[PDB]
Homo-oligomer: A and B are copies of this chain.
Amino acid sequence: WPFLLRFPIGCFGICLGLSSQAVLWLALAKSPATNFLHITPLINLVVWLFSLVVLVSVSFTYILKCIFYFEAVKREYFHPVRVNFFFAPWVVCMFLAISVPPMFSPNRKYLHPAIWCVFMGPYFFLELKIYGQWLSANPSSHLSVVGNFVGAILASKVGWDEVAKFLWAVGFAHYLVVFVTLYQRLPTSEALPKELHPVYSMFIAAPSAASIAWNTIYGQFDGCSRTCFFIALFLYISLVARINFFTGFKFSVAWWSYTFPMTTASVATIKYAEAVPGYPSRALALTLSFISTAMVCVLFVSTLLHAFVWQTLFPNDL
């Protein structure tokens, strides 16, 4: 009935809509293969702050939710679906950490190693606790895959090359089982808003994160980064082709969780253009970046215009 009680966790995904984008506009300002466009770095300055403000506000309201109604938090945690959203704040904070604007650090040779330890203490603690709790047959909504690759990226950025290999191995081990189990029962059309958002978006995006983590850790675009990227591209093509355009769709706030895969799948190709200099690669990167940015912007406008003039966004007594 009150505002605090009627608050879904999916609001974390809203941050995932923006923070990942904050990465891409940095790459377009520093990509050696995209110097034809005069993309000023100032475009990155007015996105990182917005993402940080959104994260701060959402974390604030969630903490105010926990301090008052603990029974709601306990009920939400003990769910077969909503567990995957408990890794969201760490991932969003890590994506914000990677994309610091150049103005803050004139010489960012290496970031201080405190942030990585601070952000992987609780992450491994929560992951181990969740896995142990669930272990005591569909092990697809209780294992984390995306966080390991982002952590490998962060560790490589900090300066611990050796550490990031462990995270990459753990992420690969956790991803193989999920890919084996889930692919046989992949959701069909007219099921995107059918209470599966925390699961099927971070399964077509993790293949792309590996293509970035491996390239960052090794520095050479070998065959390892040229296969996971193509697997992600094939999945993207399958989703684009199989969807039913004739049936159509209706607006939902839950669509914000499906913008992360296509947003993180364009930095992969913009970092792939650097390896193979050619017209098709640059055209593909540009068109994917354009469509991702346009969809993000139109979704933001729609959710802004559907929240203030009308007060029907928040469901009551879920």
Pick the contact of A231: B173, B227, B234, B238 (CB < 8 A). B173
Interface class of chain A by DSSP: helix
What are the nearest 7 A-B pairs in CB distance? A169-B230, A169-B227, A139-B184, A166-B230, A136-B188, A132-B242, A170-B234
* A residues in contact (CB < 8 Å) with B: 128, 131-132, 135-137, 139, 162, 165-166, 168-170, 172-173, 176-177, 179-181, 183-186, 188-189, 226-227, 230-231, 233-234, 238, 241-242, 276
Closest B residue, CB atoms, query A168 = B227
Residues of B within 8 A of A180 (CB): 176-177, 180
Q: Is B172 a contact partner of A227 (Cβ separation < 8 A)? A: yes
Give chain B nearest CB distance to A298 CB in angstroms. Answer: 27
Given A180-B180, A238-B128, do A169 and B231 touch, yes or no (CB 8 Å)? yes
Residues of B within 8 A of A136 (CB): 188-189
Query: Which of A139, A184, A276 has its CB near the most chain B CB atoms (within 10 A)?
Result: A184
Q: Is A165 a contact partner of B241 (Cβ separation < 8 A)? A: no
Q: Is A165 a contact partner of B132 (Cβ separation < 8 A)? A: no
Query: Which of A168, A226, A230 has its CB near the most chain B CB atoms (within 10 A)?
Result: A230
Closest B residue, CB atoms, query A176 = B180
Residues of B within 8 A of A165 (CB): 226-227, 230
- Number of copies of chain A assembled together: 3
Give chain B nearest CB distance to A144 CB in angstroms. Answer: 13
Q: Is A242 a contact partner of B176 (Cβ separation < 8 A)? A: no
Given contacts A170-B230, A170-B231, 14 further A-B contacts (CB under 8 A): A128-B238, A128-B241, A132-B242, A135-B186, A136-B189, A137-B185, A139-B183, A139-B184, A165-B230, A168-B227, A169-B230, A169-B231, A177-B184, A181-B184
**What are 19 A-B interface contacts by the 8 Å CB criterion?**
A128-B238, A128-B241, A131-B238, A135-B188, A136-B189, A137-B185, A165-B227, A166-B230, A166-B234, A169-B227, A169-B234, A170-B231, A172-B227, A173-B231, A176-B180, A177-B179, A177-B184, A180-B180, A181-B184
Assembled-state Cα–Cα distance A227/B171 (Å): 11
Residues of B within 8 A of A132 (CB): 242
Closest B residue, CB atoms, query A224 = B223
Assembled-state Cα–Cα distance A177/B166 (Å): 22
Assembled-state Cα–Cα distance A162/B281 (Å): 11
Assembled-state Cα–Cα distance A184/B139 (Å): 6
Assembled-state Cα–Cα distance A96/B233 (Å): 30
Residues of B within 8 A of A242 (CB): 128, 132
Assembled-state Cα–Cα distance A227/B231 (Å): 21
Pick the contact of A177: B172, B183, B238 (CB < 8 A). B183
Assembled-state Cα–Cα distance A165/B276 (Å): 13
Assembled-state Cα–Cα distance A35/B21 (Å): 52
Closest B residue, CB atoms, query A138 = B184
